[PDB]
Design a protein around this ligand. Sequence first.
Ligand SMILES: Cc1ncc(COP(=O)(O)O)c(/C=N/[C@@H](CO)C(=O)O)c1O
Ligand SMILES: [Cl-]
Ligand SMILES: [Cl-]
Ligand SMILES: [Cl-]
Ligand SMILES: [Cl-]
Ligand SMILES: [Cs+]
Ligand SMILES: [Cs+]
Lengths: 255, 395
Amino acid sequence: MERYENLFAQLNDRREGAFVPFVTLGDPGIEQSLKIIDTLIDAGADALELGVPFSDPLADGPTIQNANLRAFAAGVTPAQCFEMLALIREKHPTIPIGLLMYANLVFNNGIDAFYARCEQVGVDSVLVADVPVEESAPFRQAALRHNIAPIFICPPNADDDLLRQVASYGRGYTYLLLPLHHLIEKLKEYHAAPALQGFGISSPEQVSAAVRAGAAGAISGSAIVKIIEKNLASPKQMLAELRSFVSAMKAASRA
Amino acid sequence: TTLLNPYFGEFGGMYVPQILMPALNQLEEAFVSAQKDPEFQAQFADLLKNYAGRPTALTKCQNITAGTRTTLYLKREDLLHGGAHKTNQVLGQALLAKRMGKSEIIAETGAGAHGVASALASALLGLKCRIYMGAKDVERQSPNVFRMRLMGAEVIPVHSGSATLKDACNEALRDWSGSYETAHYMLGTAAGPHPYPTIVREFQRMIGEETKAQILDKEGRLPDAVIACVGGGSNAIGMFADFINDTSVGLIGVEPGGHGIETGEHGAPLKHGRVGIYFGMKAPMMQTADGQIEESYSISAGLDFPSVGPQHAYLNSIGRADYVSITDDEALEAFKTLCRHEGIIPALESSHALAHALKMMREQPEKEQLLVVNLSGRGDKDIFTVHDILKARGE
Ligand SMILES: Cc1ncc(COP(=O)(O)O)c(/C=N/[C@@H](CO)C(=O)O)c1O
Ligand SMILES: [Cl-]
Ligand SMILES: [Cl-]
Ligand SMILES: [Cl-]
Ligand SMILES: [Cl-]
Ligand SMILES: [Cs+]
Ligand SMILES: [Cs+]
């Protein structure tokens, strides 16, 4: 499919940034997670980034470490996650869905078979948190064979060779973790996938700032999960707070 | 792009978030530079000799082999400053950290030996040291935690995951990603992302180099086999390296069999796990059917790790090295036997290596064989554990 390409085209037409929230699948349970995700969408998420609970998430800070524990406490497995993904896509045909994965869950039952299952359930992209571009060849190849965009992180400490590689290898979008202008301009120069700023986005002003810098939008890497964490005891308030937050972040992207 | 090969056949690599790659590349370059630098090598040699006490003895164990055609030597890493082989490579890594202009050290530890080695080296060489340790480990290793603190180290409990060595491993990588401009990550075994399996081997290889010189002097030949326990791989690869091209010399690694391989409560991923990707490397892992990292088990805390360094997986795959397992009960017997018959109290880790050598002898007592066991550490740390078992048995 072309879900990212279509989104960016529609957004470019509307002079608009993308707002993309991250949540952990099955946090704090399958039923509530499905409802949380429906609320992000209803509130104006342009795309989703969805984590699969992993035993040893070495790229996650404590907010997301705690989300994984919550999900595991609810019995959530990769298989259940793929069931959830099918259900989400069946409800929501156009929203891009990206997974944030750890390498072992992709390699576990064979790299090809993992990406084939992503394609079956209608996922659009996969970011493998602990696979650098240097190790990425079998992952990128399997992704593209199955119509999945391989997403790469462009870190703060990126050099020129890295920029060319990320530009060449990535699809869908470039995850932005040299001045901020320099990176964005070079990525465009090297015809990279549109950049989304992912670095500590927790306020509307950050969303507008990212778009002004020449990024195509912003990813909220932990702010949504904080809202989950805070309202565990009140499912109702949780959804209310989620809605309010996503509305604000989205509004900031139009202007 | 790297200067050296990050793989041993299919095993190894650099499976870290992009943010950590400059740190690994910087470390590789500094290592390659240091290896060609006579001044670095002289400094390292000086610390090994005058501070740590190298060379270590090679002891012939006559009582334990009496009436058989086995001759058994123990390489006495138990006599190194700190009481384990861990000290060798911490001294090298601390010098590399200084070469790179770093002022701080991060280290993981399970049992505590590597953490104590990292804290002692840090104290000597003027580095500020923080040690990540699983909260479960901290709780049950009060003595080692206290030594680290005496030696000026910050000890940080890790409550994430299973609150153990792997999570301790993760938190160390987590920290380094942010701090690598000022801090060096002192990884404690021959595992993890390149260049650590290569660095740790080269900074442990004097074990085997000395063993070879010592056995030629004493016996006029090479050993028939050298035997070492395998937690992550450092003491074993240090013993094996200088013998790899001596094709007649057997290389035997001993993983912990725990309560028995059939129980699933063990730490023997090389022979009973499945290849996966975790802790920065592609290596045999203990893992669930759906790819979650499993919890290992051993009576010995130092062997209780659900993966193994990639060079061991490689040497196994090509048939150059053979890997076996030894259960808690076998290791305990070997511990008791060495204490009673040779007057040496071995670490329970090392006791797994000894137990397999005893089995080699006992199974075939008229086979002529010249064996060396790497006695990776002393077992002072283990006497409480052994006490409580013998008591619960009623011995
Ligand atoms: C005396 C001794 N022998 C063997 C091993 C096993 O480790 P390798 O396979 O030689 O690397 C250890 C390990 N201990 C570590 C756990 O990393 C630690 O101290 O934290 C040990 O202390
Ligand atoms: Cl949709
Ligand atoms: Cl990430
Ligand atoms: Cl032989
Ligand atoms: Cl053989
Ligand atoms: Cs003998
Ligand atoms: Cs092990």
